[PDB]
Amino acid sequence: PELPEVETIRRTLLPLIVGKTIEDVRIFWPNIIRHPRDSEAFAARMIGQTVRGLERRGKFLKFLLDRDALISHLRMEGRYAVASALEPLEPHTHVVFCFTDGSELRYRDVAKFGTMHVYAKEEADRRPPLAELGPEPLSPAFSPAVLAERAVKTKRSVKALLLDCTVVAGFGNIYVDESLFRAGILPGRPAASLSSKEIERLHEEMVATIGEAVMKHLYVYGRQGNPCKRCGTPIEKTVVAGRGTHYCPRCQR
DNA sequence: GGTAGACTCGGACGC
DNA sequence: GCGTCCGAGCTAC
Ligand SMILES: [Zn+2]
């Protein structure tokens, strides 16, 4: 999922688990557990803790417990559901947190690409995978000034810049392509080549792109060969920053 | 230490 | 039977 869908998972999952106490943690694919590296230590430390909250940083979910935080990344196929311990698990269920009320938080992931890290809450933000993560795109911490500073200092492409998770949290191939289209900026443009006006432009469209999706329709992503929705020019697809990049050669400069 | 590119997690899938 | 592919987020010069 992208940032907006992760926010939806966060918002909807929370009431379904808040105040529940973990009685057991069952792990069927230990490779998903990245910290502690020993999945048995992972399971043992969580037993007895109560879920107190659920936050999101970038595309990471942060489950807040009594002492620990559980940092979870769904990657492509990761999904959480809450269900009764009396019912058969669904396929590709790799981790299950059993609560004292007979309900379970189940983690499914056909790809097995998702990750889980557990640390004392006060440490989570300075350890992998959260350490270094850039500001939230919808927060005042992410500002034109911040973007300009990273842009001027680098030599790489504007697309590469926006894909950098230290620059801003949760911008993937898709939202980068769309934001650049709406700001009228070619993705292969050197970040340093952008004018102040262009920076403000890009920042404003990045926020609008993420923001509209979080609250509530693509221009370029995947649409190569189709007419641009603003000028009718065929959308193109190339490689920029070792990525498949979608753009309109007329709207974007 | 900036940064391009490799790397990684499985397993699907088409030759 | 082996390369090619998903793509978000360690390593060499
Ligand atoms: Zn156009």
Nearest-angstrom CA–CA distance, A13 and A9:
6
Amino acid letter for position A168: V
Cα A133 to Cα A135: distance, rounded to the nearest angstrom: 7
| Per-domain residue ranges of chain A | 1-132, 133-253
CATH architecture of A1-132: Alpha-Beta Barrel (3.20)
Is residue A249 flagged as an active site residue?
A: no
Contact between the CB of A160 and strand B at under 7 Å: yes
DSSP three-state, residue A6: helix
| Encoded amino acid at A99, one letter | F
What are the residues whose beta carbon lies below 5 Å from ligand 1 (ion)? A 228, 230-231, 233, 248, 250-251
What gap in Å lies between CA A49 and CA A24, rounded to an integer? 10
- Is the dihedral angle over the CA atoms A37, A39, A42, A44 positive or is it negative? negative
A94 in Cβ contact with A27 (< 8 Å): yes
- Contacts (Cβ under 8 Å, ≥6 apart) of A232: none
Specify whether the CB–CB gap between A49 and A67 falls below 8 A. yes
- Measured CA to CA in angstroms, residue A65 lies from A72, A83, A97 at distances of 13, 19, 12
Whether A154 sits with its Cβ under 7 A from any strand B atom: the answer reads: yes
Q: Which of residues 105-134 of A touch strand B (CB under 7 A)?
A: 111-113
The gap from C-alpha A152 to its chain's centroid, in whole angstroms, comes to 26
Q: What are phi and psi of A32, to 5 degrees?
A: -65, -30
**CATH, range A133-253:** 1.10.8.50
PDB experimental method: X-ray
Residue A122 CA, nucleotide B6 C1', distance (Å): 33
Name the E strands within chain A.
22-27, 33-35, 53-57, 60-64, 68-73, 79-84, 93-99, 103-108, 115-120, 236-240, 243-247
Q: What is the resolution in angstroms? A: 2.0
Which residues lie below 8 Å from residue A234, measured CB to CB, with a gap of 6+? A224, A225, A226, A227, A228
Catalogue the long-range contacts made by A193-198 (C-beta closer than 8 Å, 24 or more residues apart).
A193/A158, A194/A151, A194/A158, A196/A148
The alpha-helical segments, DSSP class H, found in A3-143 are 3-17, 39-46, 121-124
